[PDB]
Design a protein around this nucleic acid. Structure first.
Ligand SMILES: [K+]
Ligand SMILES: [K+]
Ligand SMILES: [K+]
Ligand SMILES: [K+]
Ligand SMILES: [K+]
Ligand SMILES: [K+]
Ligand SMILES: [K+]
Ligand SMILES: [K+]
Ligand SMILES: [K+]
Ligand SMILES: [Mg+2]
Ligand SMILES: [Mg+2]
Ligand SMILES: [Mg+2]
Ligand SMILES: [Mg+2]
Ligand SMILES: [Mg+2]
Ligand SMILES: [Mg+2]
Ligand SMILES: [Mg+2]
Ligand SMILES: [Mg+2]
Ligand SMILES: [Mg+2]
Ligand SMILES: [Mg+2]
Ligand SMILES: [Mg+2]
Ligand SMILES: [Mg+2]
Ligand SMILES: [Mg+2]
Ligand SMILES: [Mg+2]
Ligand SMILES: [Mg+2]
Ligand SMILES: [Mg+2]
Ligand SMILES: [Mg+2]
Ligand SMILES: [Mg+2]
Ligand SMILES: [Mg+2]
Ligand SMILES: [Mg+2]
Ligand SMILES: [Mg+2]
Ligand SMILES: [Mg+2]
Ligand SMILES: [Mg+2]
Ligand SMILES: [Mg+2]
Ligand SMILES: [Mg+2]
Ligand SMILES: [Mg+2]
Ligand SMILES: [Mg+2]
Ligand SMILES: [Mg+2]
Ligand SMILES: [Mg+2]
Ligand SMILES: [Mg+2]
Ligand SMILES: [Mg+2]
Ligand SMILES: [Mg+2]
Ligand SMILES: [Mg+2]
Ligand SMILES: [Mg+2]
Ligand SMILES: [Mg+2]
Ligand SMILES: [Mg+2]
Ligand SMILES: [Mg+2]
Ligand SMILES: [Mg+2]
Ligand SMILES: [Mg+2]
Ligand SMILES: [Mg+2]
Ligand SMILES: [Mg+2]
Ligand SMILES: [Mg+2]
Ligand SMILES: [Mg+2]
Ligand SMILES: [Mg+2]
Ligand SMILES: [Mg+2]
Lengths: 88, 224, 128, 33, 87, 160
RNA sequence: AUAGAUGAGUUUGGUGAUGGCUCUGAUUGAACACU
RNA sequence: GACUAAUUACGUGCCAGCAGUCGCGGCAAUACGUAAGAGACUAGUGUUAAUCAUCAUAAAUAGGUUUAAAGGGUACUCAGACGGAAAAAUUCGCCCAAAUAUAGGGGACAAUUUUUCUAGAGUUUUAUGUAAGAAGGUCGUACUCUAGAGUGGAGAGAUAAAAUUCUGUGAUACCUAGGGGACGGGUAAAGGCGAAGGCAAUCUUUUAUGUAAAAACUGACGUCGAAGGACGAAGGCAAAGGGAACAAAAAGGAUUAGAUACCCCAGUAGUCUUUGCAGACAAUUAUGAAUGCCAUAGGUUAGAUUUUUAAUUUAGUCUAUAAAUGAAAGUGUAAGCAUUUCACCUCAAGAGUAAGGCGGCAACGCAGGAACUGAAAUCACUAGACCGUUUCUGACACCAGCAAU
RNA sequence: CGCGGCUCUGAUUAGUGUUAAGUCGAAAUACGGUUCGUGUAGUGGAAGUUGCACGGGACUUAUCAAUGUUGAACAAUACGA
């Protein structure tokens, strides 16, 4: 097995999405509710608990976003030293 | 050619010509720059010329079309072979910190390896054995192995006294009311405790992730 | 391949200049005007590079290949029609050089009669 | 040659190829194949 | 840049070991007899061609490899490039 | 043949373009004839026959080259010292005139005309700094050395 | 025979090239128009 | 008007007209016509036609072909051109040096020739590695047909959605047992091989080069190469086989303003085998082959050496640069510096067309104009705009809600 | 007199050049809305379009689930943004 190549000269060395764009934590809860209605029915009693969990989602506040990741700043410092150059 | 035209080596020639005559023909030239007469007799040095570099090792005689003639060569001494032998037989000798920072570059003025391993200005290290070995192997005509054993044995007897003095120096100090602080054996263990806890918290918080995600793997949300 | 390298030993043993110097009566070419024979250093090994050996080795390859192109399905091998043409043109050049170099020496006639090399093999143009 | 100019040769070669197919019969009658 | 790292993982492991105040003895087989490794009779590397076999066990530095430790590949390379041209 | 002189001219251009302090050439009497004229004209610094490795730089003139016999003639090479003054090579351009495809010969009256900067034949007049080397029966000479000796011959190359 | 070697207009939104065309010079065993 | 020295006024209004080139004229034209003035040559002055020069615009002196006209599909080769080291003979080429110079001189180089040399080119020493090629046999995944009145018993397949279509003569789905034809999953890589075209499952058989390291051997035996000959993708022609799958043609169903088409149900040549014909390709690196040479760095392929860790080195290949080179884009193992040789180019368009000829069963191939008509065709770059282009940023732009037309 | 060459002409017929103000489509240039071109074989009023192999003069236009570290205590006259 070979080793990682040395990147050619790029206009800019950076990652598109520095911070992980996490998903809405409740879109998974809704899928569970929609899963019960398919197996247990709509007006059934088994799905009475998952519905309460779904109603608990929107009543809770949205977590605040995290501070930006400084990865792109450090990638731009070591570009010329880590790759074959920088394109003009 | 992306590079620019640097004429730094011709500042005097260019400046002296511009100052020879006056732009207003018919008048004497003005006074030249103050630096023109300063470097009048200090021309630049030749640059960019590729000479035949110093050959620290004999070049390959069998080569008929040798390449890399204008490439600097590796510096190798007879001690390189000796250093590698010693430090491979004593790997933990590399754990003894050594200061390669120079003080005044005058260390080799007080080194007379005909006396022994203990010199002036340098510590007793694997380098002393290599220098003492090289001296015996060249002056007293000893062989690589014979000179190695001699300088090597002299080096052990000195290290033994250094370790025996730490223990005795601490033992006698307490016999006359001398107390000391914490030692590495104790300090080293406390640092492990503080680091072990950080792992325990991580494991305890990381195991809850698997057991929770594992139990929730099944779609038992119906609550039948 | 075993016979290929075994034939190479036969050519070096038959046409090897280290053997024909004593087997033939007049191996070397006749002397020129004023030229006199002087002793030269001995060979440090067998003669494997003379034009006689090379022409003999090429003859073995030309037969092994020309015999495969004539066998069953040999006409379907279109790529090796160049290889046969390339072996005959390599032998033509050595025969053409050895002809003028040896100036009709007994060592030149021994090669022709033994290998059956006729003028058609080097004189004109080999068209295949 | 750019693709823009090659399309000029492309049409000239197709018009000719198309003309010979069309007149192949009368060229065969006059013995001009 | 100067690719460097901390040297305390081994620098302090040496000081912590020497704090135990214990020598290093020769490996024993299983009468415990701890013999130092710096003895003049065992700790020797310069030998004479007249050196017989009974005294070859005391040494610790040999030029040849340990046949049992080599892999089937390293052993073939050894037989082909070290012992074959020494006939 | 003339092909070796043509290779010697293009090689010295590439060695001066690369600002090399030394350069090697195949060891032939023809290359030695042109090198001696370049050294005699002041375009190169030294000429020394040696092996595939350059001699000691400092002790270049006092270098003791071994005799050239059939046992080492294949490895001999001519080592040339190149000059660079005022951040410029002294041997910038070496343009050949006579080539393997055609050997250009000049007469004594054509060389007298080319020496003063007037075209004559396939040659052109010499300007300030340019030199012209002719291979005559008296050896490789500079055009002004040839007209003085009143001889013509084969024109080799024009040295800017 | 040692003074003898020259350009200009015109392709493009623009720039640099490529490449023709035309003009600038000299002339005719000339013709035509106005004289 | 500008090139090109020399201006206004009036008339005319894309008309009449001027014009060597670019152009001028559409109601306030220094460009047309008249008037005056001005700039020139002068017994001549303009115009037409022609020749040289302009035009390195057929380049011997002295050009060029990656992207602009221009590198042959390929390299083995006859003729031809060119091509090592150190000496010698001959010509007296070459030079003095001409006047088409009798007779001599000089000896570097040139021609024929001789003798030596080993740096080019080759041979031997089973290299390693390797989808060059060919022959005779196989393997396997899937597909397909047949059979088991198999199990099961009304759908299946298709598409964005449908329709044509398949199915109660039992389909799809799930199996068992036989037959057939092609194809070649992983490995797999900037990897390799051959002159190129091209070459990727497997066993045996068979074939020429090439690469590394050491020795030995021959002793310039070399490079290029018009022509002839050979090879040459896919499609195609001819004959005899094969026929599962795919699929020009022909035909049907949809979509659409219309739909030959793009999509779909099906489907013949053909693809495959053997033997010939055929010779055109973006047959590409838009870059002929070969030789000498010029500074580095990071990968990678096959070896070699070593203190086999890792370095060193030979031959390949790719990335990014220096000197330099280039119209620039870029290249930098070359599109640089030089050299050798072959092919090819000389404004656009007509045209790779016509006619005659040659080759071929045919399809077509090779070779190859002129007339008529133009002042432009053409290349790289720069900044914009545009995109049924990417990713962002503002706006009741949209979503949502209320009201309204 | 015959055969051949050449010149002129020929019912009928083909190609191409030029010409702003006609007509029918929308093939190319952006992913040009079916990638475009080369070759070859078909096909359609026309530009076009289909099969097969081939070229980039099209996709290098490429830009993190390795998520980024208690890398040796504390205090001294040592240390002091
Ligand atoms: K072109
Ligand atoms: K214009
Ligand atoms: K003479
Ligand atoms: K002579
Ligand atoms: K190919
Ligand atoms: K089908
Ligand atoms: K249809
Ligand atoms: K490399
Ligand atoms: K250039
Ligand atoms: Mg086959
Ligand atoms: Mg433009
Ligand atoms: Mg004017
Ligand atoms: Mg007029
Ligand atoms: Mg007027
Ligand atoms: Mg007069
Ligand atoms: Mg080509
Ligand atoms: Mg051809
Ligand atoms: Mg072609
Ligand atoms: Mg010899
Ligand atoms: Mg020899
Ligand atoms: Mg060789
Ligand atoms: Mg092998
Ligand atoms: Mg049934
Ligand atoms: Mg059934
Ligand atoms: Mg099968
Ligand atoms: Mg595969
Ligand atoms: Mg190869
Ligand atoms: Mg060749
Ligand atoms: Mg040919
Ligand atoms: Mg075919
Ligand atoms: Mg076929
Ligand atoms: Mg058939
Ligand atoms: Mg085929
Ligand atoms: Mg054929
Ligand atoms: Mg192809
Ligand atoms: Mg060629
Ligand atoms: Mg490759
Ligand atoms: Mg590059
Ligand atoms: Mg044309
Ligand atoms: Mg025509
Ligand atoms: Mg014709
Ligand atoms: Mg042609
Ligand atoms: Mg732009
Ligand atoms: Mg609104
Ligand atoms: Mg709304
Ligand atoms: Mg109303
Ligand atoms: Mg008519
Ligand atoms: Mg289209
Ligand atoms: Mg369109
Ligand atoms: Mg399209
Ligand atoms: Mg197509
Ligand atoms: Mg159809
Ligand atoms: Mg495109
Ligand atoms: Mg692109």
């Amino acid at each position: 097995p070979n080793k990682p190549i040395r990147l050619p000269p790029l206009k800019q060395l950076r990652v598109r999405q520095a911070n992980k764009a996490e998903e809405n934590p409740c879109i998974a809860v809704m899928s569970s509710v929609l899963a019960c209605w398919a197996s247990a029915g709509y007006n059934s009693a088994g799905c009475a608990t998952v519905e309460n969990a779904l109603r608990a989602c929107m009543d809770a506040p949205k977590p605040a976003p995290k501070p930006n990741n400084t990865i792109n700043y450090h990638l731009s410092r070591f570009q010329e030293r880590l790759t074959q150059g920088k394109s003009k | 050619g992306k590079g620019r035209i640097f004429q730094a080596a011709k500042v005097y020639q260019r400046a002296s010509e511009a100052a020879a005559t006056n732009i207003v023909s018919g008048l004497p030239p003005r006074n030249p720059p103050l630096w023109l007469k300063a470097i009048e007799s200090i021309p630049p040095a030749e640059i960019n010329t590729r000479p035949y570099p110093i050959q620290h090792s004999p070049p390959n005689p069998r080569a008929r079309k040798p390449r890399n003639l204008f490439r600097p060569t590796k510096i190798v001494y007879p001690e390189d072979e000796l250093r590698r032998d010693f430090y491979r037989d004593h790997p933990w000798e590399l754990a003894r910190p050594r200061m390669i920072i120079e003080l005044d570059g005058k260390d080799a003025r007080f080194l007379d390896w005909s006396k022994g391993l203990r010199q002036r200005g340098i510590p007793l290290s694997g380098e002393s054995v290599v220098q003492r070995q090289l001296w015996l192997m060249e002056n007293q005509g000893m062989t690589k192995q014979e000179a190695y054993d001699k300088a090597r044995h002299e080096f052990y007897k000195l290290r033994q006294l250094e370790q025996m003095e730490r223990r005795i120096a601490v033992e006698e100090a307490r016999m006359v009311g001398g107390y000391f602080g914490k030692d590495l054996l104790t300090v080293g263990m406390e640092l492990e405790n503080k680091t072990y806890e950080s792992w325990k918290k991580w494991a305890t918080t990381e195991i809850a992730r698997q057991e929770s995600a594992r139990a929730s793997m099944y779609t038992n949300v119906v609550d039948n | 391949k075993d016979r290929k390298h075994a034939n190479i030993r036969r050519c070096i043993e038959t046409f090897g200049r280290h053997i024909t110097d004593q087997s033939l009566e007049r191996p070397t070419p006749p002397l020129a005007r004023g030229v006199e024979p002087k002793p030269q250093p001995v060979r440090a090994g067998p003669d494997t590079g003379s034009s006689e050996v090379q022409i003999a080795i090429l003859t073995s390859k030309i037969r092994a290949l020309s015999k495969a192109l004539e066998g069953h399905g040999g006409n379907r091998d279109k790529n090796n029609k160049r290889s046969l043409r390339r072996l005959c043109h390599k032998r033509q050049r050595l025969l053409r050089y050895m002809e003028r170099k040896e100036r009709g020496s007994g060592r030149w006639h021994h090669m022709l009669e033994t290998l059956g090399l006729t003028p058609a093999t080097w004189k004109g143009q080999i068209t295949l | 040659i750019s693709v823009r100019r090659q399309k000029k040769l492309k049409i000239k070669k197709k018009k000719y190829k198309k003309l010979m197919r069309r007149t192949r019969n009368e060229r065969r009658k006059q013995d001009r194949l | 840049i100067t690719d460097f790292t901390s040297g305390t993982q081994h620098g302090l492991t040496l000081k912590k070991f020497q704090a135990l105040n214990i020598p290093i003895s020769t490996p024993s087989e299983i009468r415990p007899v701890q013999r130092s490794v710096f003895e003049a009779d065992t700790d020797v590397t310069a030998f004479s061609p007249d050196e017989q076999i009974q005294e070859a066990e005391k040494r610790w530095k040999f030029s040849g490899p340990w046949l049992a430790g080599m892999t089937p590949g390293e052993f073939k390379e050894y037989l082909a490039k070290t012992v074959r041209p020494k006939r | 043949g003339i092909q070796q002189i043509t290779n010697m001219c293009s090689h010295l251009q590439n060695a001066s373009r690369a600002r090399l302090g030394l350069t090697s050439l195949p060891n032939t009497k023809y290359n030695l004839a042109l090198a001696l004229a370049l050294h005699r004209a002041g375009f190169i610094s030294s000429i020394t026959r040696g092996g595939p490795h350059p001699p000691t730089p400092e002790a270049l003139m006092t270098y003791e080259p071994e005799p050239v016999t059939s046992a080492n003639v294949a490895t001999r090479r001519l080592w040339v010292g190149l000059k660079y003054w005022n951040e410029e090579p002294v041997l910038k351009e070496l343009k050949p005139i006579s080539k393997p495809s055609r050997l250009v010969t000049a007469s004594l009256e054509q060389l007298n005309r080319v020496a003063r900067g007037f075209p004559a034949g396939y040659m052109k007049g010499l300007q300030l700094g340019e030199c012209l080397f002719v291979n005559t029966d008296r050896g490789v000479l500079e055009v002004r050395e040839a007209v003085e000796r009143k001889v013509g011959g084969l024109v080799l190359c024009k040295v800017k």
